[PDB]
Write a protein that binds this DNA or RNA. Sequence first.
RNA 1: AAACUCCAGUUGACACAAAAUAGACUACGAAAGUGGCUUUAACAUAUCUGAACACACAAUAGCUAAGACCCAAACUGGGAUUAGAUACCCCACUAUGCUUAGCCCUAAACCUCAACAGUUAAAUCAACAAAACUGCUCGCCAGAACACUACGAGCCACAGCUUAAAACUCAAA
Lengths: 118, 142, 23, 97, 48, 86, 137, 72, 128, 74
Amino acid sequence: PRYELALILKAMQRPETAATLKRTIEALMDRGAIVRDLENLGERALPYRISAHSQQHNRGGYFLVDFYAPTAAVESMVEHLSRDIDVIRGNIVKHPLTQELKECEGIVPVPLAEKLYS
Amino acid sequence: KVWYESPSLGSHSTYKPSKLEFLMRSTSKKTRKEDHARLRALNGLLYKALTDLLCTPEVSQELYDLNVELSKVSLTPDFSACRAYWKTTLSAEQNAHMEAVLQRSAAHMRHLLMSQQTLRNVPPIVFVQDKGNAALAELDQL
Amino acid sequence: KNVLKIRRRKMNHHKYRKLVKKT
Amino acid sequence: SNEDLPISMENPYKEPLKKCILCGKHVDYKNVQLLSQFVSPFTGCIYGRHITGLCGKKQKEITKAIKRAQIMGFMPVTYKDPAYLKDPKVCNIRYRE
Amino acid sequence: REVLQLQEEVKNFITRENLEARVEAALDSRKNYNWAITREGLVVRPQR
Amino acid sequence: AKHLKFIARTVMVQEGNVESAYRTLNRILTMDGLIEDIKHRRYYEKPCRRRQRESYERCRRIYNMEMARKINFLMRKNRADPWQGC
Amino acid sequence: TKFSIYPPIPGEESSLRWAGKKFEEIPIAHIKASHNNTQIQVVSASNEPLAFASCGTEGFRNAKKGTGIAAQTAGIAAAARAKQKGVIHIRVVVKGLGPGRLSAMHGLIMGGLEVISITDNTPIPHXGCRPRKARKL
Amino acid sequence: YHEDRIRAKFYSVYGSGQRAFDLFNPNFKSTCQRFVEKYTELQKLGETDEEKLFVETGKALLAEGVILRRVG
Amino acid sequence: DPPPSTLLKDYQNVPGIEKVDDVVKRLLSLEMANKKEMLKIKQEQFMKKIVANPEDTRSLEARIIALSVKIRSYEEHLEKHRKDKAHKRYLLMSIDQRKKMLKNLRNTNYDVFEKICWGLGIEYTFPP
Amino acid sequence: RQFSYLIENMARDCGEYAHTRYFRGGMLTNARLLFGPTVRLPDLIIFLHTLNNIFEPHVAVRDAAKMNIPTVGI
RNA sequence: AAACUCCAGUUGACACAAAAUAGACUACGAAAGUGGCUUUAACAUAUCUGAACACACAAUAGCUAAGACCCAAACUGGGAUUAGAUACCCCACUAUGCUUAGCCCUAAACCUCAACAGUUAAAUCAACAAAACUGCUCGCCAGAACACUACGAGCCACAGCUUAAAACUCAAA
Ligand code: FES
Ligand SMILES: [K+]
Ligand SMILES: [K+]
Ligand SMILES: [Mg+2]
Ligand SMILES: [Mg+2]
Ligand SMILES: [Mg+2]
Ligand SMILES: [Mg+2]
Ligand SMILES: [Mg+2]
Ligand SMILES: [Mg+2]
Ligand SMILES: [Mg+2]
Ligand SMILES: [Mg+2]
Ligand SMILES: [Mg+2]
Ligand SMILES: [Mg+2]
Ligand SMILES: [Mg+2]
Ligand SMILES: [Mg+2]
Ligand SMILES: [Mg+2]
Ligand SMILES: [Mg+2]
Ligand SMILES: [Mg+2]
């Protein structure tokens, strides 16, 4: 299915960041994934301190990787990201754009009698 | 309904808490079971109204800076007076400033409370001081 | 409701458990 | 029969149902600016729907988005990120003095 | 219609040949998902 | 522990008025429920007890809001007697 | 400019100053207001200890330690030792809802220190250790 | 009534008239009622489209001197 | 199981699906979908092999085939999740519902009952 | 009470009777005690309002039926 | 009071524990239960009813074996209290709460409301609870106490569970 990999990378110089992205996207491809896009969300201060691979981090590079993969690839990729020392935190979620939002007519009022009864 | 009782036969009666109603009342009459409820809940409404006026700067710049906090607000059943309690400050010097501004504000606040037509008939508010053991500070003054 | 029936059953089971322990 | 008799139909003067400020909009865990508008500035506490005015569906989406963003490294937990303090105040809560 | 739309998108998909070019083309760009809502339900895009 | 400090639950003092700053902080923590939360957490409340209290608090709020609405609605007629003598 | 109760954020350019020192450079008065005691430690922005005082170190014992006047006395003692080291402005970080929560701050002011901010850091577990069982009283 | 559909659209498009209802006069005619009568006349002339029958009605009243300020 | 290269049930009858890029074929195949999409292909395979009208989904034949696919999915789930009491219940309840369906098909249409048993590999057993 | 004065005048003008005030318990069912053993009760009671001020049926509606008095009512 | 003083405060590092706010919501599941995040699998039935025992489940506590152990904590010890206190109050600590693999099969396991279908007209209806009923089916009941007991039987249960009487006794319960 279609997944979204939210990737926080160790704050590094441009050459090492590109090598990490290439090494990470190739890991997806080796597991059968079809990578759709790569988005840079920018380098920023983390909302809190994150300890990863015997190091403390206060800034990180936020990236998104939109890709399709078989269901069995997720488990194998999660293990791959845990061993990459340049990844602070990497999570794979189902892509939000696949889930279609249902239409809403509005806010229907709730009867008070039901509230106390329930 | 809930365990809280709402079976009153005169549930549609128009609640009239005014000073004139107290005089035109049967002396034999005693407060009914759910008659205290309206009093307990109306006094709570007055607490809500007063609390918002204190924290909104539009009502008064002097009042807003004071940051007064209301400890208690209980109206009287007579409908002649209202009891409001604000928490005292440590500094007796600061206490004088708060009471002075509150004493003069109350007169305008009453008119501001009349702006709420639901509570248009508001008895004069008696801004009592409590929650800070004012006597204890008074004792140290002596 | 009252628990008087529960209390009778309570005592019967307490005494039975105690009897079994003793013997 | 008679032309002036009432006719059966649906209410023509009926007004549309109310909608929350977020009705019809996608709530993403990466949109921390939006999510921050529904947490306490001082404590980071998620506001109840009686404060946010959101409907049950969007209150849930916002909550799940905040919780996801917090633990994935996009949003702080214990306070509102100060960058977002000057955004539109859409919550019915009054704090300061 | 979904197969046609998807057949065009595949032209822009990342591949092993064009991986290096797309990686560098991303470090120079910025994607912003942030926006705020108002009491009237209007989106307020960021000042960039 | 891992977050930045002097942002959460932090109030600045104005013109040396520390009493008003403390009252603002206490009002903040009260409105967010932290004061009641800290107090309930001194001793363990058992799950059956927490559900009973949460159910009682939710029903009391509903009853109080419903009783306020009734008084507000039925106070419109608190005006002076229009037909005095009849 | 209008007054902001939100503290200045480090790294941004604020105009606020206290004796030429920025908010990030003001020493910190750590007040631990427990149910039976109150502990006050003043430290520098670099985490250098400058003064320590508690109700117990001020000669209060048993239930007397858990009083407001005992905490107020502890604040005065810590303020005196801190003022000798060059402290005027302090940021107050109080953790706990004990009786010396507010009184400990008064003593710091009566001792010659100026409080520029108040921060609550009372530990609240987000789900944490199970507290001791309720008391039957 | 059938005309209620026309009244809902008129109030949506043009809002309530700044002219005040006089419910004491049993023969009072509001701007909406005047609009409804013209809309009914034009429908009887064979026109059947709804969006077209509504725009032509506004023009007729403007020609007669009626003030129709669109709400938006 | 059907090969992973098998197209989804929805995209198998679109005109020109055999001339699209290989990447597009992977994205419309079972390999890139969840297991529920693989079960829809299995159910359709059994429907065409067994039932007279492969498009009649409300007949007793189609229901037995649909339920038999669910039963096999539960068995594979429980092969990996042996302490999942929730699905062990769903499996046993589904087996009982299929036996009830087979009982009603055997009583009404024996010729079709025999083809259902051969096609799905069911050995009917009388209750104790 | 908006119409108490109007109704009382209409009754006097037509030569009939009006009771627009608080209705005391037993005016009809206990009339002999309240008025006297020879008191004549009404042969027809006309209600211009059938509800009391607490939005309950006027007690005279029930008590009129008890005394077999026909009632006209808006 | 005892207790600790290898203690306390600040800062940093840090889990096989527990999951503020949201939640003023009332959702999911057969019930038991389920409220931090993510992914995978996944929530029977195109009539209905249908079991103490068949089949599969079943909070807490408990048992067997190996682990984890922050915190809580039967028991136990200590410190008070008291006429006594093998209680309530304070401190310490263990079984245990957790994980794994097996058992045990009990709850005020309770909306104290059997499933399914239908009705709002009759009489509204002992009372209270939770407005009053109809059709249909399964389970169950027939004064109290003896009795969540005895015996029998089955059971990984061996101070256990399920099923479950009789005699004497009373005019009530
Ligand atoms: S009102 Fe439509 S999604 Fe909230
Ligand atoms: K949590
Ligand atoms: K119950
Ligand atoms: Mg007994
Ligand atoms: Mg059945
Ligand atoms: Mg059964
Ligand atoms: Mg049986
Ligand atoms: Mg049983
Ligand atoms: Mg069990
Ligand atoms: Mg256990
Ligand atoms: Mg311990
Ligand atoms: Mg232990
Ligand atoms: Mg239960
Ligand atoms: Mg049944
Ligand atoms: Mg008996
Ligand atoms: Mg038992
Ligand atoms: Mg037994
Ligand atoms: Mg036996």
